[PDB]
Design a protein around this ligand. Structure first.
Ligand SMILES: [Zn+2]
Length: 151
């Protein structure tokens, strides 16, 4: 049910990920479907999900770190973010100050590794000045539906 895609098809995905500084240029990809979403694999692991928008998997985030839209959360937030909980401002340690409501964000533990992908619900300015409110909704996390669907 998987198929390696052409060089030109892969290039499109590389370019999409390069938008966030995630560098996979030159990596060959296999694609698979569920018609509710598709996944692009690198070496047997799902790396990019097509579920509305193209979403990097937490595996890709840890294999090739993004260079923008990063949000670091504290120890207390991590376990719930790992379960798909929304992200609240009080648990944010730092973040890219260029983040605006609507941007895709990449959530990382204070220990360095990435734990989820989110969609910002607030601008970085308001989050860091108030430290209150829902900063983002999580759209991908370990063991979620995307990962269960694309072993
Ligand atoms: Zn929880």
């Amino acid at each position: 049910s998987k198929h390696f895609i052409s060089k030109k098809e892969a290039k499109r995905i590389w370019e999409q990920m390069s938008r966030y500084g995630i560098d996979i240029t030159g990596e060959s990809l296999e694609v698979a479907a569920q018609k509710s979403a598709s996944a692009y694999y690198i070496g047997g692991k799902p790396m990019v999900f097509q579920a509305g928008d193209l979403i990097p998997s937490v595996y890709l985030l840890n294999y090739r770190n993004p260079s923008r839209n990063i949000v670091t959360v504290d120890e207390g937030a991590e376990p719930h973010i790992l379960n798909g909980s929304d992200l609240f401002a009080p648990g944010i340690v730092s973040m890219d100050d260029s983040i605006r409501k609507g941007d895709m964000i990449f959530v990382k533990s204070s220990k360095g590794y990435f734990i989820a992908v989110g969609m910002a619900e607030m601008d970085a300015g308001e989050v860091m000045a108030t430290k209150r409110g829902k900063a983002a909704r999580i759209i991908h996390f370990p063991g979620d539906e995307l990962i269960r669907a694309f072993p």
